[PDB]
Structure 1
Amino acid sequence: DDKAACADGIAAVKARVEKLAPEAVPQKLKRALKIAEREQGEGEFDECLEALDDAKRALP
């Protein structure tokens, strides 16, 4: 469901980001991940998924 997809998506995006040089991680990518995590914590798993969409589009 959205909750599992949100958690899986956060891990998937992080795993891809963690293969980047840290000094090269865009601020927009960090912010999108943080928004996703905030919304996950609020139980807005659907909004987490939309923030993950933004994070993926911010990947170099």
Structure 2
Amino acid sequence: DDKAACADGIAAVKARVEKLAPEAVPQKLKRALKIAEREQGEGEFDECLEALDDAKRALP
């Protein structure tokens, strides 16, 4: 469901980000991940998924 997909999506995006050099991680990508995590913690798992879509678009 959206809760599982949000948790798995945060893990998947972070796994890709952890392949980049830390000094190569765009601020917009960090911000989008933080928004997804905030929404996950609020129980807005649907909103988390939409923020994860933004994070993927920020991947270099």
Task: Please tell me the TM-score bracket, short chain as reference.
Answer: over 0.9
Match of 1:21 in 2: 21
Aligned length: 60
User: Structure 1: where are the runs of 5+ without partners?
Assistant: none
Deviations 1:3-57 (A, max 9, x none): 0000000000000000000001000000000000000000000000000000000
User: CA–CA distance in 1 between the matches of 2:55 and 2:18?
Assistant: 13
Percent identity for Structure 1 against Structure 2: 100
User: CA–CA distance in 1 between the matches of 2:32 and 2:48?
Assistant: 9
User: CA–CA distance in 1 between the matches of 2:15 and 2:40?
Assistant: 18
Name the TM-score, length of structure 1 as normaliser. 1.00
User: Structure 2: where are the runs of 5+ without partners?
Assistant: none
